């Protein structure tokens, strides 16, 4: 990990920016994965899957 | 280096948690759904004599 150390950990400002970026991107990735699991587990039960949606007389 | 790399992973989660909690408090102060539901309508009116103003 010493090569990554020489680019990210030599200065605390870069390290802090790396932490900010990791929070942003990792939270986005986890959100996407959780939503994928949610969709895969609830097939057919969504509002957008109502057969008669738009068809109330 | 390995230690610094490992710690940054949890330092991601701590930053995300802090951001989430602060933004949850800030946005709880924003306009509520009942408030936003009453932001559009139309009203008709008539005529008034010249030189006057109706509020």
């Amino acid at each position: 990990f010493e090569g990554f150390y020489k680019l990210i950990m030599r200065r605390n400002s870069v390290y802090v920016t790396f932490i900010i970026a990791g929070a942003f991107f990792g939270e986005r990735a986890v959100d996407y994965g959780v939503h994928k699991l949610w969709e895969r587990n609830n097939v057919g039960k969504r509002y957008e899957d109502i057969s008669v949606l738009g068809q109330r007389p | 280096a390995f230690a610094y790399f490992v710690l940054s992973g949890g330092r991601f989660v701590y930053a995300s948690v802090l951001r989430l909690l602060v933004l949850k408090l800030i946005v709880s102060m924003s306009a509520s759904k009942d408030v936003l539901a009453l932001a559009s309508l139309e009203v008709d009116l008539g005529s008034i004599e010249p030189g006057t103003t109706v509020t």
């Binding site: 200065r11 870069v14 802090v16 920016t17 900010i20 929070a23 942003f24 | 951001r19």
Partner: peptide
Amino acid sequence: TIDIQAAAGWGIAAAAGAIWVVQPFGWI
């Protein structure tokens, strides 16, 4: 000539943090 580089690094950090709290992607 290191204080200027420190200022630039911390300015980049501050910008990154700003875009991260407020996330103004629908406004840009």
